[model samples]
Target: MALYRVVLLGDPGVGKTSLASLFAGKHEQLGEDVYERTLTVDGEDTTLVVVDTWSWSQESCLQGGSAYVIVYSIADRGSFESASELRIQLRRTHVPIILVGNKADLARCREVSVEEGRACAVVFDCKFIETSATLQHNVAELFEGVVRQLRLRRR
Candidate 1:
């Protein structure tokens, strides 16, 4: 059975809901606020949980997290730091981690540059992606990427 509890971590203002809605199709909506569904995307049978958490602690989410997503708002530099700080804590163990810079449409006020995000991810050795919840950019690909990476570990 292929099942992954994909936990999403980010600051409060990082558009988690917006991008999360784009991922799970929640009809436009938090502790243990998890959504699980199996859908076929580009010939891949994908199933996973988009989990919500306030902070990190030793819990089931961590125990069962197949992949971790570090999300931050491009407009807020504080959130960017949060992403980096979060990354270090997660670096303790080897799990598929993906860095997401949400709110790509806010390029006008973009505090975190695309290169910055990629640089962080590059050092961390994880997948880096920029997404726009407004334009629905990379929403599907993020999920697909998670599935694909999980499959890699499976293989």
Candidate 2:
């Protein structure tokens, strides 16, 4: 079985924790959380370890992380900016980075348009997807994309 490590990065309360839970096939009460999951990708078994906090443990986590998920809240422009900054810092890592705009269910309140998020991902050379952790929108697809890329890397 292949083991995959993914690190989730975002500003406080940007739904990073929620996305982590969704990826794990369950949802937890909102708060800081880290988790691990074993999933079958491309007919191959794999262990996926995910961490939502990278502050004190960045060096350790980044070392093992095969991919990075940079999440932001579409309702908050500041959160998007933070994610962009985080992407800039992660650019040199050369690991697969997924730029996510969370809270897509709140279209009326969305401060960051989808085009802007996609544009940022283009500039950063990362994959982009919008999701709503609450509504479970594109949540599974997000992890699927990551695992697919990881599987390709194995080949």
Candidate 3:
């Protein structure tokens, strides 16, 4: 039973809350600033504390964690494109993280291409995955991938 702290980051109104609900059954309407949610994964006995913060402090959240996970909206290419800056932010903390592209179900409205997302992850030296909150698609896999990555880190 381990604890994992992750941060959902991106431009404002990128469906961060909706994404969290798909995983933890928790949804929060974000105001002008960011909010935090704590979700416990039952089978793994892993408590995932998700901090939905303003774009400024995302890097700070990455600190003091066994691993870091950053969630971005796939439909919004701007968010996906910003991965370079986001990746740089995390690097300052020296934490290993996985880059997640959320809202995969909205591919029709997707501004970011799969290749672009993969390229961003590659450039950041992070793993990548696409998830959707509406269909509850790949939501679990997002966490699973992070856990898997962390497991590999120990080996």
List per-prediction Cα lDDT, in the order shown: 0.82, 0.83, 0.66
- The TM-score values for the models, in the order shown, are 0.87, 0.87, 0.75
lDDT of 1 at 139: 83
Candidate 1 lDDT over residue span 1-155, tens digit each:
47778889889988777766776685444334667778675586778878765434555555567899889989999999988888777765457999999999988999999899989998888999998889898888888888888888978
Question: Which residue pairs collide in model 1, if any?
Answer: none
Tens-digit lDDT track of model 3 for 20-88 = 666555435645333233433435555566555545454456565666566678777677667667677
Clashes of each: 0, 0, 0
Off by over 4 Å in 1: 26-32, 55-58
Error of 1 at 2 (Å): 1.8
Q: Report per-prediction Cα RMSD to one decimal.
A: 3.3, 3.6, 4.4
Question: Ten consecutive residues with minimal summed lDDT in candidate 3?
Answer: 32-41
- The digit string of per-residue lDDT tens for model 2 on 3-120 reads 7778898888889888888877745655455677887766877787787775646566556679989989999999998887887676544578899999999999989998999999
Candidate 2 lDDT for residue 129: 96
